[PDB]
Design a protein around this ligand. Structure first.
Ligand SMILES: Cc1c(C=O)c(-c2nnc3c4c(C[n+]5cc6c(C)n(C)c(C)c6c(Cl)n5)n(C)c(C)c4cnn23)c(C)n1C
Ligand SMILES: Cc1c2cnnc(Cl)c2c(C)n1C
Length: 330
């Protein structure tokens, strides 16, 4: 089997991407944030504290003839931005782009933190990291991909995120029309539950490539690119007026700037992020100071190849017995 679904930016800055997912019988379609940095499929629901729902579409398990309460199971998660959610668990039929999993754990939120409430466009998350990170207790549950894998034509999914435009998540096949050149595959460590890999270096603009190992995670849930402070300083030093602002929370730059590109290495291959992918717009409405899309990972404890990086590539998440990642230009 295969599946193919379009993923759409939630706003004009590509702050996140939503992908429609069918849950239950008859189907209830919710728009989920596909997140290769976590492993829970959770949704706003008829159980979510009413004051914490503000415009999201909810899953109502009592209206699904295939929903079954997973007795005694609870979940609770907290994300890298400090947001969180928790609740109980059903199993139900879940379909993505024509690919169906029966008996998928659907984690129903009873509580969500303010950033979830305040974002009406995201109805939940669909985790695509390794199932070892799943938070369901006392019996850990499998991701949608893990459940689907054995049925897929090939045990892979691909992320093809757009810059200020829709893109595609495919399951079970590699669309050879979706990229240029070849796909370069690179080793993955699953020891922390992530799609963790080692980039071979970077360049800023038309500058020379610096060969240096950068260990980090391919994380579709993360908006920005988080790299070591040395690398990030070298990038922003090429932008007149750019500075790190403690009050704002990162590097900012004059909105009048023309940003240089940023290149990262995948083996001997190179992925070029155009400068405009690095512009996240005014820090507050009407400001002439703009927020940068490349930020320091100092304090995070891990480097994160988030959407800024991934949207410059066609990315293969290869879930073979030994997982690997593939990157192609496009
Ligand atoms: C260690 C880490 C992260 C790891 O991932 C991270 C991060 N970066 N984007 C996101 C996340 C997103 C994506 N996301 C970002 C958004 C931004 C920047 N803005 C203005 C809006 C309105 C957003 C929405 Cl609705 N959604 N979502 C939905 C969740 C649950 C995230 C959790 N963390 N996160 C940050 C800021 N940090 C420090
Ligand atoms: C001030 C601000 C941000 C902070 N953190 N992330 C993103 Cl994408 C931001 C955009 N404007």
């Amino acid at each position: 089997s295969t599946g193919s679904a379009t993923t759409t930016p939630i706003d004009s800055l590509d702050d996140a991407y939503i992908t429609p997912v069918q849950i239950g019988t008859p189907a209830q379609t919710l728009n989920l944030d596909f997140d290769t940095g976590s492993s829970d499929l959770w949704v706003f629901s008829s159980e979510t504290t009413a004051s914490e729902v503000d415009g999201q579409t909810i899953y109502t398990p009592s209206k699904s003839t295939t929903a079954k309460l997973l007795s005694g199971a609870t979940w609770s998660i907290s994300y890298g931005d400090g947001s969180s959610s928790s609740g109980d668990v059903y199993t139900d039929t879940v379909s993505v782009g024509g690919l169906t999993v029966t008996g998928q754990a659907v984690e129903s939120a009873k509580k969500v933190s303010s950033s979830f409430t305040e974002d009406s466009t995201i109805d939940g998350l669909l985790g695509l990291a390794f199932s070892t990170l799943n938070t369901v207790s006392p019996t850990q549950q499998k991701t949608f991909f893990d459940n689907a894998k054995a049925s897929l034509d090939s045990p892979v999914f691909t992320a093809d995120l757009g810059y200020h435009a829709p893109g595609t998540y495919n399951f079970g096949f590699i669309d050879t029309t979706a990229y240029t050149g070849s796909i370069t595959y690179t080793a993955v460590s699953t020891k922390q539950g992530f799609w963790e890999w080692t980039s071979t270096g970077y360049a800023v603009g038309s500058g020379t490539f610096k060969s240096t190992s950068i260990d980090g995670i391919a994380d579709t849930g993360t908006t920005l690119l988080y790299l070591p402070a040395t690398v990030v300083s070298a990038y922003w030093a090429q932008v007149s007026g750019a500075k790190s602002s403690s009050s704002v929370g990162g590097y900012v730059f004059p909105c009048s700037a023309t940003l240089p590109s940023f290149t990262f290495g995948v083996g001997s291959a190179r992925i070029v992020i155009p400068g405009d992918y690095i512009d996240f717009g005014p820090i507050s409405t009407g400001s002439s100071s703009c927020f940068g899309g490349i930020q320091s990972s100092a304090g995070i404890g891990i480097n994160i190849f988030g959407d800024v990086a991934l949207k410059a590539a066609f990315v293969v998440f290869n879930g073979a017995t030994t997982p690997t990642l593939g990157f192609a230009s496009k």
